[PDB]
Design a protein around this ligand. Sequence first.
Ligand SMILES: *[C@@H]1O[C@H](CO)[C@@H](O[C@@H]2O[C@H](CO)[C@@H](O)[C@H](O)[C@H]2NC(C)=O)[C@H](O)[C@H]1NC(C)=O
Ligand SMILES: *[C@@H]1O[C@H](CO)[C@@H](O[C@@H]2O[C@H](CO)[C@@H](O)[C@H](O)[C@H]2NC(C)=O)[C@H](O)[C@H]1NC(C)=O
Lengths: 209, 209
Amino acid sequence: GGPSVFLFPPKPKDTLMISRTPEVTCVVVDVSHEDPEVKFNWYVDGVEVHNAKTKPREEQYNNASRVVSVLTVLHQDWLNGKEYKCKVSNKALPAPIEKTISKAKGQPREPQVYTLPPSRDELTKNQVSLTCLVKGFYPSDIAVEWESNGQPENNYKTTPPVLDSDGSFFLYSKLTVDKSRWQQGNVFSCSVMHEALHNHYTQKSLSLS
Amino acid sequence: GGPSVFLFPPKPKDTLMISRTPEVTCVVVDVSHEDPEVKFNWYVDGVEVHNAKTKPREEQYNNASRVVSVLTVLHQDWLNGKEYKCKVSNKALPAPIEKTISKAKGQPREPQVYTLPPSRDELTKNQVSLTCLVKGFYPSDIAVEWESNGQPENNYKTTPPVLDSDGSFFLYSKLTVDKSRWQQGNVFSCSVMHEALHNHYTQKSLSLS
Ligand SMILES: *[C@@H]1O[C@H](CO)[C@@H](O[C@@H]2O[C@H](CO)[C@@H](O)[C@H](O)[C@H]2NC(C)=O)[C@H](O)[C@H]1NC(C)=O
Ligand SMILES: *[C@@H]1O[C@H](CO)[C@@H](O[C@@H]2O[C@H](CO)[C@@H](O)[C@H](O)[C@H]2NC(C)=O)[C@H](O)[C@H]1NC(C)=O
C-alpha cells in the first residue's frame, strides 16, 4: 500500500538532434486498486501544459498498477534549463505528489575526444581494442558511437560517465575488431554527441599508423 | 513502519591479500522503536558461526534506528564460493528475514592489462591522460591503482566494471599527470589486483617511447 513517483529525463541523443523526439517520462508505481484513477498535471517553468500522452495502464506483480504519462518536450527548452514538473493527483494520497527535473546546472563544457590504438601487447590476440577517450565534458548527458566506412559497428561498449577531479566528466568507449581488419589499414571512427560541441557532434578517426 | 535488510560483500582488495581483513556486512534499516532489539544469526554454508560484531546503533532521520552487524570472513572461504547468510530476527517481523550473498558464480577469468599513452592530440594541453585498459576478467571484483617510483599517484579515476559482449568484464583507469612529467621520461605503473592473477596481482608500466 502506497503509490510512488519517478521522473525520467529525455535521452541524450533525442535533445541534441532536431529530427528526434525528446520526451520526459512520469512513472507512477504501486497504484492502489481501491483508487485506480491518476490525474497528471504537467508544468514547464511553472506554466501548465497539455501535450502529454498517458500510455496504457500496466499490471504490476503485487496487486497494484503502473500508469505512465509521457511529455513531449522542445529541444531548446530542455537545453536551456527549463524545469519540468509532473503533478500526480490520486485519492490514496494525502496530497498530490509533485516531482521535478531539469538539465543539470553548471557551465556546459566541451568534450575532448581522443582515439587510442591497441597496445602492442594486444596484437598477439585474435581481436584488438580500439579506445575512444572522451573527457572534460559537462553535463554528463552524452552519446558515443563507433563506425567504419559510414556504417555502425556492432561490437563496442561504453562506460558510464565518471566524475573527474575537476568537476567535469569522462568516459571511454571500447570497440573490438578482428586483428585482421585493424592491420589491413581499415579506418574506424568514434562519434560523439554533446550539447557543447559545434552542431552537437564531432568525430575522430583511428587507423593503422 | 517496516524493517528491511541489506547485505554487502567484502571489499575486493580485502579478499585478495592475506594481510587484510575481509568482512561481510549485515545492515538493518528502519528499526521500529516499539521493537529495538535485533538478533543476528550468521551462517557460512549453512553452519552457524559466531565471530561477528555488532557495531553501535545509529539513529536514522525518520524516527527509526539502524543496526549493523559485521562478520569477519576467511579469504579462502570467500574466494571458494561459500555462501554467507545473515539472519535478522525482530519482533516487528512476521518472520526472521534471511539474506544471502556469495562470490559471483562462473569460471574466474584473468584480466588482460594494457597501458596506453596519450593521443598525440593531447600533447597540446598542460596535462595528459595515461590510460590503463583492463579487460576479459571475471568475476567483476577487482581493484586498480596507479603509481610511479613506488609511490601511489593521486590524480586518477577508474570506471566501474562494464559487462562486455563475451560475458567477462572490462574497465579503464585514467591517470592525469602534468605534461612535463610525461615528456621527461618518468615511468608510471598500473597495478591490478584480481583473484585470477598469479599472486592476485600484476602491474604494467608506461613511459615515453
Ligand atoms: C488486491 O488489492 C485490492 C485492493 O486494491 C484488495 O482488495 C480489497 O480486499 C479487501 C478484503 O481484504 C476488501 O475489504 C476491499 O474492499 C477490497 N478492495 C477492492 C478495491 O477490491 C485485494 O484483496 C488484493 N488482491 C489480493 C489477491 O490480495
Ligand atoms: C517515533 O516512533 C515511535 C514508535 O517507534 C512513536 O511512538 C509511539 O507513539 C504512539 C502515539 O501515536 C504511542 O501510542 C506508542 O505507544 C508509541 N510507541 C513507543 C514505543 O514510544 C513516536 O510517536 C515516533 N515519534 C515521532 C516524533 O513521531
